[PDB]
Write a protein that binds this ligand. Structure first.
Ligand SMILES: *[C@@H]1O[C@H](CO)[C@@H](O[C@@H]2O[C@H](CO)[C@@H](O)[C@H](O)[C@H]2NC(C)=O)[C@H](O)[C@H]1NC(C)=O
Ligand code: NAG
Lengths: 167, 56
C-alpha cells in the first residue's frame, strides 16, 4: 500500500565512469532525449571502463525493492564504442541472490527506433542484508530504490476509466 | 554409473559457486570450469558462478 523512494547509490558518486551520458532518443522527456529516472545508464570514461565493485547495505527497518538492468547491444562495434571491454558481465549477490548476467548480442528489429535491448531485474533486499554488484560493462545501476512502508489488501485493477472524485 | 538395478534411481550431485577467482584457483587450480552431466534424457553443462555474497 505504500513505497517510500530512497536514494541508495548516488548518481554523483560515479567518479571513474560517465554517468550523465546514458541517454536515448527512445526516451524523450521534452526534446532533450532522456532515460529511466531511477536507474543510471553508466558508460566508459576517458577511453575505459574500470571494474565496478559497489554495494548497498539495508540499514533500514523494512524490506527494500531494488531494481537494476543490463544492456544488450546490436553488435560488437557498439559494445566497444560504449564500454570498450568486449566481454562483459554483471554479477549481483545477496544472502539469497547469486546472479551473473551476460550481455547478449543479436540483430533485432528497431522498436522505438532502437535495435538494442534493456533487460531489467529486481530483488527484495531484507533488512540488515546487502546487495553487492560487480561489473565490467553493460550495467544499468540503481540510483533510487523503494522501501516497502506498508503492506495490506490491494489489487491492480485493469480499467480504462479515470478518477471520479468520489468515495 | 550405469543402473544395473531394476528400479528407478534418484541421483543427486552439486556445484560450488566460490567467492572470488582467488578461492577458485586455491581449491581447483583451473580458473574456468564446468560440470557436464548426461543421460538418455539429461543434457546439462553447469558453470560455476562468481559473485560477492553475504555470509550465511
Ligand atoms: C549491514 O550493516 C550492519 C552494520 O551496520 C551489519 O550488522 C552486523 O551484522 C552482523 C552479521 O549479520 C550482526 O550479527 C551484528 O549485529 C552487526 N554487527 C555490528 C558490529 O553492528 C550487517 O552485517 C551488514 N550486512 C551485511 C550483509 O554485510
Ligand atoms: C586519460 O588517459 C590517459 C592514459 O592513457 C591519462 O594519462 C590521462 O590523464 C587520462 N585523463 C584523465 C582526465 O584522467
Amino acid at each position: 500500500n505504500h513505497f517510500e523512494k530512497i536514494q541508495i547509490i548516488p548518481k554523483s558518486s560515479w567518479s571513474s565512469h560517465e554517468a550523465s551520458l546514458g541517454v536515448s532518443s527512445a526516451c524523450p522527456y521534452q526534446g532533450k532525449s532522456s532515460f529511466f529516472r531511477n536507474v543510471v545508464w553508466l558508460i566508459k570514461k576517458n577511453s575505459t571502463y574500470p571494474t565496478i565493485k559497489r554495494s548497498y547495505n539495508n540499514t533500514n527497518q523494512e524490506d527494500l525493492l531494488v531494481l537494476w538492468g543490463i544492456h544488450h547491444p546490436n553488435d560488437a562495434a557498439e559494445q566497444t564504442k560504449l564500454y570498450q571491454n568486449p566481454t562483459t558481465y554483471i554479477s549481483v549477490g545477496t544472502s539469497t541472490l547469486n546472479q551473473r548476467l551476460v550481455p547478449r548480442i543479436a540483430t533485432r528489429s528497431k522498436v522505438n527506433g532502437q535495435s538494442g535491448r534493456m533487460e531489467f531485474f529486481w530483488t527484495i533486499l531484507k533488512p540488515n542484508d546487502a546487495i553487492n554488484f560487480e561489473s565490467n560493462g553493460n550495467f544499468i545501476a540503481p540510483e533510487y530504490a523503494y522501501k516497502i512502508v506498508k503492506k495490506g489488501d490491494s489489487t491492480i485493477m485493469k480499467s480504462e476509466l479515470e478518477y471520479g472524485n468520489c468515495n
